[PDB]
Amino acid sequence: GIVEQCCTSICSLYQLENYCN
Amino acid sequence: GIVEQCCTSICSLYQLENYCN
Amino acid sequence: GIVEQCCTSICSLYQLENYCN
Amino acid sequence: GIVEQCCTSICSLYQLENYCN
Amino acid sequence: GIVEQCCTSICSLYQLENYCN
Amino acid sequence: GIVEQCCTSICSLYQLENYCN
Amino acid sequence: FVNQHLCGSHLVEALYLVCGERGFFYTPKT
Amino acid sequence: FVNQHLCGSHLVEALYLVCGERGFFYTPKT
Amino acid sequence: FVNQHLCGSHLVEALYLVCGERGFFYTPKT
Amino acid sequence: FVNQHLCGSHLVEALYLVCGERGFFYTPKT
Amino acid sequence: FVNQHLCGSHLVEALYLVCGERGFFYTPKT
Amino acid sequence: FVNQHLCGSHLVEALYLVCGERGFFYTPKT
Numbered sequence: 010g011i012v013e014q015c016c017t018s019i020c021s022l023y024q025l026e027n028y029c030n
Numbered sequence: 031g032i033v034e035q036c037c038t039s040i041c042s043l044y045q046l047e048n049y050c051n
Numbered sequence: 052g053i054v055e056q057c058c059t060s061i062c063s064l065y066q067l068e069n070y071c072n
Numbered sequence: 073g074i075v076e077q078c079c080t081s082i083c084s085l086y087q088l089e090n091y092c093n
Numbered sequence: 094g095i096v097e098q099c100c101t102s103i104c105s106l107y108q109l110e111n112y113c114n
Numbered sequence: 115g116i117v118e119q120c121c122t123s124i125c126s127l128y129q130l131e132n133y134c135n
Numbered sequence: 136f137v138n139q140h141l142c143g144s145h146l147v148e149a150l151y152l153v154c155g156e157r158g159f160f161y162t163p164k165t
Numbered sequence: 166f167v168n169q170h171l172c173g174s175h176l177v178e179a180l181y182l183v184c185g186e187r188g189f190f191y192t193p194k195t
Numbered sequence: 196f197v198n199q200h201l202c203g204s205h206l207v208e209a210l211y212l213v214c215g216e217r218g219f220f221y222t223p224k225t
Numbered sequence: 226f227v228n229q230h231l232c233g234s235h236l237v238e239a240l241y242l243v244c245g246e247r248g249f250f251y252t253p254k255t
Numbered sequence: 256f257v258n259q260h261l262c263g264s265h266l267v268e269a270l271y272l273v274c275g276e277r278g279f280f281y282t283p284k285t
Numbered sequence: 286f287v288n289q290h291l292c293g294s295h296l297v298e299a300l301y302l303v304c305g306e307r308g309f310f311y312t313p314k315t
């Protein structure tokens with residue numbers, strides 16, 4: 010999930026947008 | 031400038047990106 | 052909604068708790 | 073103290089209230 | 094007090110330092 | 115740099131002022 | 136707990152603290 | 166832009182800054 | 196609500212959100 | 226250092242930075 | 256991404272997120 | 286004042302609080 014993508018691994022701002030509504 | 035623009039109006043992440051080194 | 056309520060008025064942590072998954 | 077309770081270990085918001093005045 | 098002063102006016106880090114334990 | 119001085123090692127607020135313009 | 140006055144990202148921080156591992160949804164108007 | 170570790174409240178702050186008015190969900194359990 | 200690690204500035208932010216107007220003390224030395 | 230305009234949790238963050246391991250007390254009016 | 260309304264330290268946080276390891280400069284007026 | 290670890294967004298928040306109107310540069314690469 011987001012934590013694995015962005016905290017445990019690294020993510021871009023674009024990937025973060027995956028979690029917008 | 032950007033510091034004022036973002037606070038008195040709005041600004042975009044793209045505008046902000048101009049302030050990266 | 053809650054985002055507006057908390058900012059234009061006040062809101063409680065109990066109200067906020069309703070927004071947890 | 074608070075650091076041991078809440079940072080080193082975990083604490084609830086209620087436990088956090090222990091440190092209110 | 095300091096909480097109000099810093100928000101309604103300004104305050105210095107030196108003023109703030111008075112609130113350390 | 116600042117990260118080494120202040121994150122990896124520790125720095126004072128005065129040392130932080132080294133990075134003001 | 137006390138009532139809160141939370142704007143902007145402060146609300147999100149509060150939701151984060153309140154919801155913990157449950158997570159939360161942030162749904163502003165418009 | 167960059168890729169970096171975003172954890173905890175920083176992660177939700179980042180979501181709040183990327184999504185804004187769209188809103189977002191923070192669902193650490195998946 | 197939840198139980199979670201609250202450290203550093205996040206801890207005091209959490210105290211600020213739980214205590215608010217009551218105020219609080221943050222005394223890491225104990 | 227420069228003078229500060231700090232409301233809400235921003236003040237608490239500032240107190241946190243200024244006081245370090247000493248900690249601090251946050252005592253709003255009323 | 257959405258447009259931003261960012262004052263104070265919120266702008267700096269945003270710059271931090273946007274610039275990552277590149278860093279950034281924060282240059283207010285006056 | 287104190288000496289403490291200031292990392293990441295907390296570092297830039299601290300720079301923002303120490304430098305304020307002077308502005309600052311955050312250049313992690315050196």
Ligand SMILES: [Cl-]
Pocket residue numbers: none
């Ligand atoms: Cl604010």
Ligand SMILES: [Cl-]
Pocket residue numbers: none
């Ligand atoms: Cl952290």
Ligand SMILES: [Zn+2]
Pocket residue numbers: 175205295
């Ligand atoms: Zn943090």
Ligand SMILES: [Zn+2]
Pocket residue numbers: 143145235265
């Ligand atoms: Zn704020």
